[PDB]
Amino acid sequence: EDSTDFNDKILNEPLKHSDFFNVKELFSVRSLFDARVHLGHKAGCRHRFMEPYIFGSRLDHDIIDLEQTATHLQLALNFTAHMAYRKGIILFISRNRQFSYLIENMARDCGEYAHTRYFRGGMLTNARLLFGPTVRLPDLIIFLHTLNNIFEPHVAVRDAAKMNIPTVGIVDTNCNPCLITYPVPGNDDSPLAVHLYCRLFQTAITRAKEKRQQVEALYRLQGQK
Amino acid sequence: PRQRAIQWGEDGRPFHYLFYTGKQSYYSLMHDVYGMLLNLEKHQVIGSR
Amino acid sequence: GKATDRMDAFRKAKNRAVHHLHYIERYEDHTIFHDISLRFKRTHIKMKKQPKGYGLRCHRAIITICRLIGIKDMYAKVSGSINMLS
Amino acid sequence: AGSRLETVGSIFSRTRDLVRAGVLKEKPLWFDVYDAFPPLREPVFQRPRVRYGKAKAPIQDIWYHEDRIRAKFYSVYGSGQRAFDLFNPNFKSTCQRFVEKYTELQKLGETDEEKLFVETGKALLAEGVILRRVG
Amino acid sequence: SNEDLPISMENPYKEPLKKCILCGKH
Amino acid sequence: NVESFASMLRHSPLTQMGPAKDKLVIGRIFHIVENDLYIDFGGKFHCVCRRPEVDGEKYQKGTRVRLRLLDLELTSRFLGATTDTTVLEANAVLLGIQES
Ligand code: FES
Ligand SMILES: [Mg+2]
Question: Does D81 touch chain A (CB under 8 A)?
């Protein structure tokens, strides 16, 4: 009786709006350009599945089309916010050791989880044996870097798909985005770009959690009276 | 023997933000020591083993 | 499933298969949607859509699998290598 | 649980089908979100292939009309001893200041190339710019 | 359409091909 | 009247610089390891230069230096590889300190 009204006013309501959390106000094509998000690797490193997202090559240096980055980033931030709103477990992953400390702090600050260390075989596909039969796996995995330190795809991309966990991922011009659910073409090397990503996801997640509390609190006050 | 307490609550959310590494205590210590080495940079035997 | 004992191999195989499930589309819940002709490695399989009452006229292993999927009417011919796993 | 055949369809199609077939008792927490706001591309595994024969990548080189003026300026006057400041988003080098003057004079009607390049150098020297020919 | 789009042309910064010390000599 | 990406790219200092070889740029030291100076100069990758022998103590975090660029990204394809090997750092020569 009361459960259907709960799920209808709290869980189904936000899914009826194109931008319920107003994540489009967090960035612009200019702010992405100032953070050097458009700078890609040299043409000799290009991955074939990244050609659709490449604006061109400026003196053998691939340029990422920020017009597509903005549309992909909008979808990725929107999905992340809805998952945080629904109280999902969000796990950030990245083997780039220059940003390990930054990413672990960002995860602790937004109330989520980080795994920037060596990824042991079976953390996801054998979790019930490694953690316990009642362990809950992440509802969303966000790759700030999709490659491991030998320039191969992070093993967790394949294993997240095996466990049917949606993935958000920053994909540089040398990355493979085929199995990434919500890919975002962009620079994953420059500190300005990585810092921007961390601010956007952290802000999107923090807003969505505050929105969930505002809606719940309002739903309870109106319930009594 | 000293046993480690529950690592997640009733809702299933782990308590520690480094839970999914499988070594949250070890990496939580490496993170704290690494953070102190950074702050020092921003600012700047016989009887023990 | 692989093990030293046969019953252990049975356990491993069937418990693992339930985590690698396909979904097979069925026309009117009794046959395939169209004729299928493919090669996997060296094994050729040719399957024909059939009307109701035709039955399963296929390699005995294909009959077994069709009963598990829910296909009632189909013709199949296997050529080349008759490797069970392929 | 869900099928682990990550190369057969996508997590959405595999989940949707097993929910239809009653195999999955409940839909995962993310399913309704994906359905309402799907990605631009369904995440399906694909095998990368090397190109053979006459197949080429469709990526084009990024050129601008002013690149011809820059190539000539660097060949005549070399890289300006002034250092680039790529942190300033509005930085203007001696070459860019040369390109702008060159463009202004071209809009005034002048069409010759060799003549339009010598007049630009004089204009900058009058403004106090240092232009040391490399040779 | 748009004036700021790239244009197709040959590399203007392309360096001339190198020549051996005997190029053009009998 | 929203500026498009094509307009930003055309008028960016990195685009106006043209080829990077033998170009003088201004860098910033953001990380130091013993005598290895990690310098950001506005590109995708940083460069690593060794502390000069003269006035070595003047090179600290935040110090702005002058560089002569050689390549924005060091890459190369070697025998049998399907893609280029990249060391994820630029190549530049540290000339000295920038002063006003
Ligand atoms: S390069 Fe040797 S003859 Fe021209
Ligand atoms: Mg990269």
Answer: no
